[PDB]
CSV table of C-alpha atoms in Angstrom, one decimal:
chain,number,residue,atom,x,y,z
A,1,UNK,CA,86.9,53.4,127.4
A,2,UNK,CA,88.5,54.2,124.0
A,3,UNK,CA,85.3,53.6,122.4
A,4,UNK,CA,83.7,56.2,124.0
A,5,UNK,CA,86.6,59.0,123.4
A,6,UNK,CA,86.6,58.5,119.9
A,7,UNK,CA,82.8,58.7,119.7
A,8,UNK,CA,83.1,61.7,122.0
A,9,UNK,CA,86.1,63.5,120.0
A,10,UNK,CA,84.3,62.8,116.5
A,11,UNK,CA,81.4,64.0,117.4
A,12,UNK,CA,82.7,67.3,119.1
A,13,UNK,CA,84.7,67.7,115.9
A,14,UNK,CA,81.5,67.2,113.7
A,15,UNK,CA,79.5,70.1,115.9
A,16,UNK,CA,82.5,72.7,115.4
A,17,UNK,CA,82.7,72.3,112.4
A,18,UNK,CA,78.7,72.7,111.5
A,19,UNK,CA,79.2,75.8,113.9
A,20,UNK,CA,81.9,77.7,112.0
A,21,UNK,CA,80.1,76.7,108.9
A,22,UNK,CA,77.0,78.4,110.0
A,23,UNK,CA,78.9,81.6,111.3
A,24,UNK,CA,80.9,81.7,107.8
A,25,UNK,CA,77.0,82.0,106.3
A,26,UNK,CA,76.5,85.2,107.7
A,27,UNK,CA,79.4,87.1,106.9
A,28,UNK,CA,81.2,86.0,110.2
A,29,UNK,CA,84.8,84.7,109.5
A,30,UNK,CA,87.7,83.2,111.7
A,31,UNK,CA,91.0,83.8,109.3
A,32,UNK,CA,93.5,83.1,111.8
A,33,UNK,CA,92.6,83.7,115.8
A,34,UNK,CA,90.0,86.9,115.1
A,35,UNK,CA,86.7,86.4,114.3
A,36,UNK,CA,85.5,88.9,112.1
A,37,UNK,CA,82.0,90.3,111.2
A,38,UNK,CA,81.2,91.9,107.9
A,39,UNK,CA,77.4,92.8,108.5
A,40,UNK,CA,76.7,95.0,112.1
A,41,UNK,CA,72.9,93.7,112.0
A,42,UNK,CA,72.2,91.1,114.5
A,43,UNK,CA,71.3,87.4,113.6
A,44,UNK,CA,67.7,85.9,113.0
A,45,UNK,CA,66.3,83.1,115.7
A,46,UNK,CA,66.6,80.2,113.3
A,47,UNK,CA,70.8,80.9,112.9
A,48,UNK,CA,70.3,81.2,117.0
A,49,UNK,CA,68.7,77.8,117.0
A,50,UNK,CA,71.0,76.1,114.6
A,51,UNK,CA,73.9,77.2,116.9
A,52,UNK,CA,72.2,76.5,119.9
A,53,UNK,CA,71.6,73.1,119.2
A,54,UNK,CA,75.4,72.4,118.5
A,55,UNK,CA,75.9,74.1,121.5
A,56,UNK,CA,73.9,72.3,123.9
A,57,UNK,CA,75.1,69.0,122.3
A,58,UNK,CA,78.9,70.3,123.6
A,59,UNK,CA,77.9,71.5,126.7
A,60,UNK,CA,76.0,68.3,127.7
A,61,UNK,CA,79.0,66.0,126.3
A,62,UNK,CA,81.6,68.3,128.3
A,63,UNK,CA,79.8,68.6,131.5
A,64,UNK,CA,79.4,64.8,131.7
A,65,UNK,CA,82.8,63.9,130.8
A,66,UNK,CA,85.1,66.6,131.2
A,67,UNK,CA,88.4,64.6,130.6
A,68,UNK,CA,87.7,64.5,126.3
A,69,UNK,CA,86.3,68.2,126.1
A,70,UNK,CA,89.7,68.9,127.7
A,71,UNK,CA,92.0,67.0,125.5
A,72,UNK,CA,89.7,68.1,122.3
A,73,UNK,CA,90.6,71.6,123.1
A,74,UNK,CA,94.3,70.9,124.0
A,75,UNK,CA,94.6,68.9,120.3
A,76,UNK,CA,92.7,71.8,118.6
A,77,UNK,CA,93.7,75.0,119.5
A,78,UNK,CA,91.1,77.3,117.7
A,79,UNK,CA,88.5,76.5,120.1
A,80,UNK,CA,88.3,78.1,123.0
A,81,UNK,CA,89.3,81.7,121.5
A,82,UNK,CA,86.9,81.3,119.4
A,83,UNK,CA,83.9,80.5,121.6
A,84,UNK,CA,85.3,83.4,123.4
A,85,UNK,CA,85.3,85.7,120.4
A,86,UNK,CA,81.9,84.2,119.2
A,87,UNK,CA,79.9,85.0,122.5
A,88,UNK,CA,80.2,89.1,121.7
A,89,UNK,CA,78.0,88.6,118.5
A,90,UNK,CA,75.6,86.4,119.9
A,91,UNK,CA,72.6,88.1,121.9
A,92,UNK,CA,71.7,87.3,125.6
A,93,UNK,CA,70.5,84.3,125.1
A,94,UNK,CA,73.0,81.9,124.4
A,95,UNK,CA,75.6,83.8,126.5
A,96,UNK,CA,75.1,80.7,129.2
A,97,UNK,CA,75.9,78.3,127.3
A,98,UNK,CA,79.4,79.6,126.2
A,99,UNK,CA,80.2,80.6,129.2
A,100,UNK,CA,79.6,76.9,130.8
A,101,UNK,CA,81.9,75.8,127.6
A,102,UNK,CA,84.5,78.0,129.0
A,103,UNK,CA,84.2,77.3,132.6
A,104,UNK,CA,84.2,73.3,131.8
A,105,UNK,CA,87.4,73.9,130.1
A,106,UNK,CA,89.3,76.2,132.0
A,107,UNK,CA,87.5,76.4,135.5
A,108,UNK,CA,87.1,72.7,136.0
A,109,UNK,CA,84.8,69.9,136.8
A,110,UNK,CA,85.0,69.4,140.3
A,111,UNK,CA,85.8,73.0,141.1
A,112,UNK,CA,82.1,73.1,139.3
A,113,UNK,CA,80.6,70.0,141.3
A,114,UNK,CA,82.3,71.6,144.7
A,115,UNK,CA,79.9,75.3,143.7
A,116,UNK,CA,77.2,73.0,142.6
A,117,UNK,CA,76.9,71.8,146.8
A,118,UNK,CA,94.9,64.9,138.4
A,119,UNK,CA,95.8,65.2,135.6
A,120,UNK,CA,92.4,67.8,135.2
A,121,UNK,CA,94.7,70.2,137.1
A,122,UNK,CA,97.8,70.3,134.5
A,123,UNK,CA,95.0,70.4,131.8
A,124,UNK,CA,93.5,73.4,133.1
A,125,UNK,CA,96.6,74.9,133.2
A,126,UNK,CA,97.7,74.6,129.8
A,127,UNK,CA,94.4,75.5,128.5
A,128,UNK,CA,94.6,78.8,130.9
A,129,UNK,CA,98.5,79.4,129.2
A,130,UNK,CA,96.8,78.9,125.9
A,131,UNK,CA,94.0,81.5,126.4
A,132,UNK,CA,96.1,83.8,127.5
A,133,UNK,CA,98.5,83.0,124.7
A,134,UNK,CA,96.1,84.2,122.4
A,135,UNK,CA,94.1,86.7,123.6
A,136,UNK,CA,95.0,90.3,124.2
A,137,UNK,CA,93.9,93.2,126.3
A,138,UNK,CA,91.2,94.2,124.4
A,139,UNK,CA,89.6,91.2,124.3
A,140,UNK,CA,90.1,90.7,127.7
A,141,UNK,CA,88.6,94.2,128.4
A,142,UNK,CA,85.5,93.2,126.5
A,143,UNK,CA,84.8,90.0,128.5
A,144,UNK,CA,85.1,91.6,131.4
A,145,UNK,CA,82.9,94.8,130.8
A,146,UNK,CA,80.0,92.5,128.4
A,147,UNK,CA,79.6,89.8,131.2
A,148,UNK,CA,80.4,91.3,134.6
A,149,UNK,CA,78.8,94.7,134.8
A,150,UNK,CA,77.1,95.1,131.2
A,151,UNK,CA,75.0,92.1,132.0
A,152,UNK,CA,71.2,92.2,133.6
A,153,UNK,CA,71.2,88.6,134.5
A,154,UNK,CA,73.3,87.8,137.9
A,155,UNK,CA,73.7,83.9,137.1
A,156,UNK,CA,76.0,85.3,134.2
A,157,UNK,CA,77.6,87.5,136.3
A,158,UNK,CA,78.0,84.7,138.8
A,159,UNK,CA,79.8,82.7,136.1
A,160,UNK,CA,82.0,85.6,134.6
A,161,UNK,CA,83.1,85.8,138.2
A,162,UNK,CA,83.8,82.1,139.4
A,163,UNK,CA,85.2,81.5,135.6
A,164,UNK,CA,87.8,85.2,136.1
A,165,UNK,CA,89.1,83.9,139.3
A,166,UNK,CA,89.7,80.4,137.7
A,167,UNK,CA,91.3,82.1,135.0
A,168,UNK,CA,93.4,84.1,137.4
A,169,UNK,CA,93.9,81.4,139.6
A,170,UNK,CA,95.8,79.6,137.5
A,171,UNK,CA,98.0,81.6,135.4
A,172,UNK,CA,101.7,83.2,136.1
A,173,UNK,CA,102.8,86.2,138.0
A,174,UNK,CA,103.6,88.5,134.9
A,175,UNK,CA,99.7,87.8,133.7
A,176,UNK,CA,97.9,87.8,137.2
A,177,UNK,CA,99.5,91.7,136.9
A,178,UNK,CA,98.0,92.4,134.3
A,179,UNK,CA,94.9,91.2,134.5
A,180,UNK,CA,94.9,93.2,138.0
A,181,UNK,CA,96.0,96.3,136.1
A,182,UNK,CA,93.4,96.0,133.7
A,183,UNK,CA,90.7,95.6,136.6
A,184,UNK,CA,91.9,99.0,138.1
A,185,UNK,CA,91.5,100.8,134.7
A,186,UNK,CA,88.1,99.3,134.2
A,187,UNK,CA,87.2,100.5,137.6
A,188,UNK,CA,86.5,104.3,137.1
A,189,UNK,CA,83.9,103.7,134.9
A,190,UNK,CA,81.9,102.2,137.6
A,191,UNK,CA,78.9,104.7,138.5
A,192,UNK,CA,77.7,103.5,134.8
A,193,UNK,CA,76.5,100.3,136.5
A,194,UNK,CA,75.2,100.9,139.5
């Protein structure tokens, strides 16, 4: 079984790094936890397909074994913020795709095979204390306006929602509050969505 988490750890390694490579192309830098864009143009389809391909190698490696996706993001801690920060630049597209990173991380895997019909549970928790550890309001404000009321699509907004209450579920009193508070200040702008 060690043969196959090495395989699987190297070769989710190998795909991050030709993904930040291919972001750092176009202008798009991660210095320390922000990802930064120098050019306000959107991207071309064959940068789309060179990340997408990365992508749907990690998604299908996470979503069959969940257990090494976890413990890659626990070793490296630049990950998951940074999926989340990448998936505002990225169009419409490959939205899904980030999401079901996110969701394999933080949500679970048989929270996901339960909605498809334990040591998973304290990795889902630390992962949840890490994301929250890094990321601010602001960016918390943008995931929630970008992929549960901004978004046309309702599988997205099916997954914002099941991956916000996993996010919620699992986290501490103090950030359950504010994540509530920021809900209620989000909420009065809600005849722009119909």
């Amino acid at each position: 079984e060690k043969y196959r988490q090495l395989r699987d750890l190297h070769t989710l390694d190998s795909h991050v790094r030709g993904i930040k490579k291919l972001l750092e192309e176009q202008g798009i830098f991660l210095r320390a936890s922000v990802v930064t864009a120098s050019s306000g143009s959107a991207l071309q389809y064959d940068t789309l397909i060179s990340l997408m391909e990365h992508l749907k190698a990690c998604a299908e490696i996470a979503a069959q074994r969940t257990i090494n996706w976890q413990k890659f993001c626990i070793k490296d801690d630049s990950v998951l913020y940074f999926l989340l920060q990448v998936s505002f630049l990225v169009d419409e597209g490959v939205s899904p795709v980030l999401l079901q990173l996110l969701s394999c991380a933080l949500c679970g895997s048989k929270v996901l095979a339960a909605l498809a019909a334990s040591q998973e549970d304290q990795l889902c928790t630390a992962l949840v204390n890490q994301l929250n550890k890094f990321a601010d309001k602001e960016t918390l404000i943008q995931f929630l306006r970008c992929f549960l009321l901004e978004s046309n699509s309702s599988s997205v907004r099916w997954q914002a929602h099941c991956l916000t209450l996993h996010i919620y579920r699992n986290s501490s009193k103090s950030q359950q509050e504010l994540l509530l508070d920021l809900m209620w200040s989000i909420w009065p702008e809600l005849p722009a969505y119909g």
